[PDB]
Amino acid sequence: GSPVDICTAKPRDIPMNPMCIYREQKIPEATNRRVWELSKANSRFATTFYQHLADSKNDNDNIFLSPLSISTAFAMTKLGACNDTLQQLMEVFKFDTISEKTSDQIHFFFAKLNCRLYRKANKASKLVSANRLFGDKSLTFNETYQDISELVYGAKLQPLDFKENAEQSRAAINKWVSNKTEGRITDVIPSEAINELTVLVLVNTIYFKGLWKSKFSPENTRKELFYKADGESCSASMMYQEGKFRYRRVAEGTQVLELPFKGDDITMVLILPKPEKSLAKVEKELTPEVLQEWLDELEEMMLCVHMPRFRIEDGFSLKEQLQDMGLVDLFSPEKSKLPGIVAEGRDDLYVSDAFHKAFLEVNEEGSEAAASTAVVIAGRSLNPNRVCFKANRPFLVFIREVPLNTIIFMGRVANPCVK
Numbered sequence: 001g002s003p004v005d006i007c008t009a010k011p012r013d014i015p016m017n018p019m020c021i022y023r024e025q026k027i028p029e030a031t032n033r034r035v036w037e038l039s040k041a042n043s044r045f046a047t048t049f050y051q052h053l054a055d056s057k058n059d060n061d062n063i064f065l066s067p068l069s070i071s072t073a074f075a076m077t078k079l080g081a082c083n084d085t086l087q088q089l090m091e092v093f094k095f096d097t098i099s100e101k102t103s104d105q106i107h108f109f110f111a112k113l114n115c116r117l118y119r120k121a122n123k124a125s126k127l128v129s130a131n132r133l134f135g136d137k138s139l140t141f142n143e144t145y146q147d148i149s150e151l152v153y154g155a156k157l158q159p160l161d162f163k164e165n166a167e168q169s170r171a172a173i174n175k176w177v178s179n180k181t182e183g184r185i186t187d188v189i190p191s192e193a194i195n196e197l198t199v200l201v202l203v204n205t206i207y208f209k210g211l212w213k214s215k216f217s218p219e220n221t222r223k224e225l226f227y228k229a230d231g232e233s234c235s236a237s238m239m240y241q242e243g244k245f246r247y248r249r250v251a252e253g254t255q256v257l258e259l260p261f262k263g264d265d266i267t268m269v270l271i272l273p274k275p276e277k278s279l280a281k282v283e284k285e286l287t288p289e290v291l292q293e294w295l296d297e298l299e300e301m302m303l304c305v306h307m308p309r310f311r312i313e314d315g316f317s318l319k320e321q322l323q324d325m326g327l328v329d330l331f332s333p334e335k336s337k338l339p340g341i342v343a344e345g346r347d348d349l350y351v352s353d354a355f356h357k358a359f360l361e362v363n364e365e366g367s368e369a370a371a372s373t374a375v376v377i378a379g380r381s382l383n384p385n386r387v388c389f390k391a392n393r394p395f396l397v398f399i400r401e402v403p404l405n406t407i408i409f410m411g412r413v414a415n416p417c418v419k
C-alpha cells in the first residue's frame with residue numbers, strides 16, 4: 001500500500017487533522033496509558049447507556065447491545081463533526097472524562113484498540129466488526145475524512161443512491177452487513193426505515209463466534225426451573241459443569257462468575273444476585289469502577305455451576321435512546337454540523353438514523369457454536385459435598401476483551417425459556 005500499518009505506527013507519524021478540536025489512577029503494569037483511558041471512556045458510556053435503556057424496558061425482558069460497537073460507530077461520525085454536533089458526542093460518549101491528550105487523538109487510540117481487538121489467534125475465538133457510514137451520492141465527501149476512516153476504522157464512507165433508489169440502497173446496506181457477519185446478522189435496516197429523503201445513515205454491529213475454554217457436557221444439560229421476575233417460573237435447558245472458575249461473592253450475596261473462551265482474551269462474566277434481591281437494584285448500583293473492583297476481586301475457585309442455554313438479542317434504533325440521553329444536533333438537519341464529511345453539497349448533512357444489531361446465543365459448546373438436540377432429561381439430584389452457583393433467576397451478562405479491558409457486549413438474561 002501507500003501509508004504505514006497504523007497498529008505499529010505512533011502519533012509521531014500519520015498526520016491526523018480533525019477539522020474541529022474540542023480542547024495516577026492505578027493503571028495495571030504493562031499497559032498503554034492512552035488505550036486504557038479510551039477504554040475507561042467506553043465502559044462509562046456502556047453502563048450509562050445500559051441503565052438508561054433498562055429503564056425503558058421491563059424487568060422481565062432480556063436485553064442485549066454492544067456498547068463498543070456504538071461507541072465506535074459514533075466516534076467515526078465525530079471524525080468530522082463540530083461545535084454542538086461534537087460537544088454532545090464527546091459528552092454523551094464520555095470522551096470528555098479523559099485527558100486532553102486522549103480526548104484529542106481519540107481516533108488514533110481507537111485505531112490502536114481496534115488493532116489489538118480485530119487481529120487474531122483466530123482460534124474458535126473470532127470477532128468481526130461491521131460499522132459503516134452511508135450517505136447519498138448527490139454529495140462530495142471530504143477525501144481527507146475518507147482516508148483517515150479507512151486507516152483508523154477501515155471502511156471509509158459509502159455513497160448510495162437514497163434519493164432515487166432507497167429500497168435498492170437498503171438491500172445494499174443490508175447485503176453488506178449480512179456479509180461481514182458471515183450471513184448471520186440479517187436485515188439490519190428494516191423496510192421503510194430508509195426513503196428518498198434519507199441523507200446519512202449509520203449502521204454498526206459486532207459478531208462473536210467462540211468456544212468455551214471449558215465446554216459443558218450435553219449429557220449434563222437438563223430441564224430445570226428458571227424463576228422470572230414476575231414470580232412466574234418456566235422450564236429451561238440448564239447446563240451443568242464442575243471445575244475451577246474465577247468466582248467472587250460480593251455485596252448482598254450477589255455472585256460474579258467468569259467463563260473464558262478458548263484464548264482467555266474474551267470471556268463472559270455473569271453478575272447473579274441472590275434469590276430474593278432484585279436485579280434492578282444491582283443494575284442501578286452498576287458503575288464502571290464497581291464492575292472493575294469486582295473483576296479484580298475475582299479468584300479462581302472450585303465450584304458447581306448451573307447455567308442455562310439462551311439467546312438474547314436486539315435490533316436497535318439508537319436515534320431515539322441516544323438523543324433522549326442528550327445526543328441532539330447530530331440527528332437534527334437544522335442543528336447538526338459535520339463539515340468534516342461535506343462542505344455543503346446539497347445542504348445540511350446529518351445522521352438520518354443509526355441502526356444497531358447484536359445477539360448472543362450460548363450453549364454447551366460456546367457462543368454461536370454447535371447446538372445439540374439430545375432430548376433433555378428432567379430432574380437433578382442435589383450435588384453432595386457442595387451447593388452450587390445457579391443462574392435460575394435474572395442475571396447480568398458481559399462479553400469482555402480482557403487484555404484491552406473492553407466491554408464488547410452487555411445484556412440481561414431475564415427470561416431464557418422455551419421460545
Ligand SMILES: *[C@@H]1O[C@H](CO)[C@@H](O[C@@H]2O[C@H](CO)[C@@H](O[C@@H]3O[C@H](CO)[C@@H](O)[C@H](O)[C@@H]3O)[C@H](O)[C@H]2NC(C)=O)[C@H](O)[C@H]1NC(C)=O
Nearest residue numbers: 016017018019020021079080142143144145339340341343
Ligand atoms: C477535510 O477534512 C479535514 C478534517 O476532517 C480537514 O483537515 C484540516 O487539517 C488541518 C491540519 O493542519 C487543520 O488545521 C488547523 O490548524 C490550526 C492550527 O492553528 C488548528 O487550530 C485547527 O484545529 C486545525 O487543526 C484544518 O483546520 C482542517 N480543516 C480545515 C482547513 O479547517 C481538511 O482540510 C478538509 N479538506 C477539505 C478539502 O475541506
Ligand SMILES: *[C@@H]1O[C@H](CO)[C@@H](O[C@@H]2O[C@H](CO)[C@@H](O)[C@H](O)[C@H]2NC(C)=O)[C@H](O)[C@H]1NC(C)=O
Nearest residue numbers: 020081082083084085086335336337338339340
Ligand atoms: C461554531 O460556533 C461558533 C460560535 O457559536 C460560530 O461562530 C460564529 O458563526 C456565525 C455564523 O453563524 C458568525 O456570524 C459569527 O461571526 C461567528 N462568531 C461570532 C462572533 O459569534 C461558528 O461559525 C460555528 N462553526 C460552524 C460554522 O459550524
Ligand SMILES: *[C@@H]1O[C@H](CO)[C@@H](O[C@@H]2O[C@H](CO)[C@@H](O)[C@H](O)[C@H]2NC(C)=O)[C@H](O)[C@H]1NC(C)=O
Nearest residue numbers: 171172173174175176177178179180181182183
Ligand atoms: C459479502 O458477500 C460475499 C460473502 O459471502 C462476498 O463475496 C464476494 O462477492 C463479490 C460480489 O459481491 C465478488 O466480486 C467477490 O469475488 C466475492 N468474494 C470475495 C472477494 O470476498 C462479497 O464481496 C461481500 N460484499 C457484498 C456487497 O455482498
